[PDB]
């Protein structure tokens, strides 16, 4: 409808596919090369369906802090025999706050969903399901089981995937420039 939601669908229509574990189906963010992310709670194994392709994992670290603290973040190199258009240069190089915020999602059950989230505060600390998690994201958006994995952005920054919600508040973990040095 506007600028927010056009930076959002440009990232949704080539960075993004459907990543289906044991665990359901989730919005999956591809970076670069053959490399995506996905919410850690995914959990990932062997082989993951990538579009409802049987793809073998050839590599998926659960990423922590040096404090040796949850990030919620799985990074997954993908057996795929394609890439993904580069958008490092999209992510933000630090911890921040950020207005007018997007988060997009798309799977079998919610295809082509983007939703305006609002603010965004860097709200750090999460009991996150039981597990403490650092970099935490959040907005004042009722969102549902569904949208894990769904994209966080900003016009021009790619800032973040969603990982929980409380009902009243949705939770997103960073994505730092950091993460994809190669
Ligand atoms: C639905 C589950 C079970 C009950 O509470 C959980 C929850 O709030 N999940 C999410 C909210 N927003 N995004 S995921």
């Known amino acids: ?8 669908q440009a990232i949704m229509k080539k960075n993004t596919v459907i990543a289906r574990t044991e665990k359901g189906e989730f919005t999956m963010l591809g970076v670069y090369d053959r490399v995506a992310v996905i919410p850690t709670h995914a959990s990932v194994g062997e082989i ?9 994992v050839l590599d998926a670290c659960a990423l922590r802090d040096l404090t040796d603290t949850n990030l919620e973040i799985t990074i997954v190199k993908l057996d795929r025999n394609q890439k993904f258009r580069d958008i490092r240069h ?3 190089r630090c ?3 950020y207005n007018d915020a997007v988060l997009s999602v798309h799977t ?11 603010q ?3 709200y750090g600390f999460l009991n996150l399901g039981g597990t403490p998690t650092h970099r935490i994201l959040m907005y004042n958006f009722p969102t549902r089981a569904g949208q894990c994995g769904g994209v966080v952005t900003t016009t ?7 990982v929980g919600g409380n009902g009243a508040q949705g939770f997103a973990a960073m994505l730092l420039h ?4 190669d």
Do not use: C, Q, W
């Open 108 to 118: 079998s059950k919610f295809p082509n969903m983007y939703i305006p989230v609002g």
């Open 156 to 162: 021009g920054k790619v800032i973040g995937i969603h």
């Open 90 to 92: 999209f992510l933000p």
């Open 1 to 8: 409808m506007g600028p927010g939601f056009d930076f959002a």
């Open 178 to 181: 950091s993460y994809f040095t």
């Open 120 to 122: 965004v505060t860097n």
């Open 95 to 97: 911890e921040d706050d």
């Open 48 to 56: 993951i369906y990538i579009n409802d392709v049987e793809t073998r």
